[PDB]
Swiss-Prot record, chains A, B:
A Pfam family recorded for this sequence: Globin
Protein family membership: Belongs to the globin family.
Database matches in PANTHER family: GLOBIN-LIKE PROTEIN
Sites bearing N-acetylglycine, chain numbering: G1
This protein's record includes keyword Metal-binding: yes
Keywords, alphabetical: Acetylation, Heme, Iron, Metal-binding, Oxygen transport, Transport
Protein name: Globin D, coelomic
């Protein structure tokens, strides 16, 4: 329990920061790719997943890769993520994220469900095996998912 | 009452279409501009407005132009609108719009509230008085707000 200075308290650093801008560009050639991929994977270990997304709605877990009611979330979330990227240390990062915390905080998205996304995201970054991408991204992206994920709070405000 | 072919049944035409792509570009220099402007206006004639948006939440109708919890909706909705623009005759326009129809259809957004947005949008286009912009945009944009607005249905499905 805390009541803090609420900002994404230190967004890595300029030296670490810069990478997630030029890396995002590379991995977001594939708006339907990297994210729909990042998602079919989360759905394979977790059960709890495929039922809490209204439009994927319990119809067929495993069969995926792409088709109709899923190519929609592939982009929907991805241009809006290029909004979080664009607002990296730009004031409206609090108010932006909070309307999104209003979404997830409803259903029952918490600390369990979050460490599905954030380590399957780590695996997506392996398939772009252009040899050993530096350990500063293996700190940095881990440091981002640690401070940007709904600024940690969702149900954390008593 | 109908059960139709549901698509945005004829998105104007290539001849009319083209304009809303090169016009969108001009008017979406100002992501916080044109939309926050398009919105402060809706709020001046309608009462019903300023209370149904969770983040503008009843605190001060008239004072606006910009500040914190409103510069957030200014962009949020605008990159996602460049998604509808980008998907003009691209299959995922049904599934894209429908998750958005799921949002508005909840509260009580209907045919009344819609002809606030769509004629205040007409007025925004006047302030870009670069002399008399052709009557084909004064058909076309009127023809778009007539077929893209949550593909008309929201509460229209019995
Ligand atoms: C960096 C990670 C994530 C971000 C920033 C993100 C982003 C988004 C976005 C943009 C939306 C739409 C919000 C709106 O309605 O305005 C969304 C929807 C959703 N998210 Fe998160 N998401 C993330 C992680 C997760 C995780 C780990 C869960 C875990 C349960 C999750 C579950 C959902 C659900 C249930 C929806 C509803 C889909 C709908 O009907 O539109 N997301 N997310
Ligand atoms: C071309 C016109 C419009 C479009 C495409 C549009 C788009 C959007 C978008 C992108 C959202 C966020 C949906 C989400 O949660 O994922 C939104 C929210 C909302 N819209 Fe619409 N809008 C339009 C017209 C209107 C009108 C005329 C009303 C009338 C009442 C309205 C009221 C709302 C409300 C109540 C919100 C909730 C804001 C929030 O808490 O995020 N909008 N709209
Ligand atoms: C969010 N998915
Ligand atoms: C929608 N505003």
């Amino acid at each position: 329990g805390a009541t803090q200075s609420f900002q994404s308290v230190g967004d890595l650093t300029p030296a670490e920061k810069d990478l997630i801008r030029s890396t995002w560009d590379q991995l977001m050639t594939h708006r339907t790719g990297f994210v729909a991929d990042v998602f079919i994977r989360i759905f394979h270990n977790d059960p709890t997943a495929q039922r809490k997304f209204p439009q994927m709605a319990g119809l067929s877990p495993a069969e995926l890769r792409t088709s109709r009611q899923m190519h929609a979330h592939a982009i929907r979330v991805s241009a809006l993520m290029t909004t979080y990227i664009d607002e990296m240390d730009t004031e409206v990062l609090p108010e932006l994220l909070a309307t999104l915390t209003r979404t997830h905080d409803k259903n029952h998205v918490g600390k369990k469900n979050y460490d599905l996304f954030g380590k399957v995201l780590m695996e997506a970054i392996k398939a772009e095996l252009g040899v050993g991408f530096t350990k500063q991204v293996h700190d940095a992206w881990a440091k981002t998912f640690a401070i940007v994920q709904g600024v940690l709070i969702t149900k954390h405000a008593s």
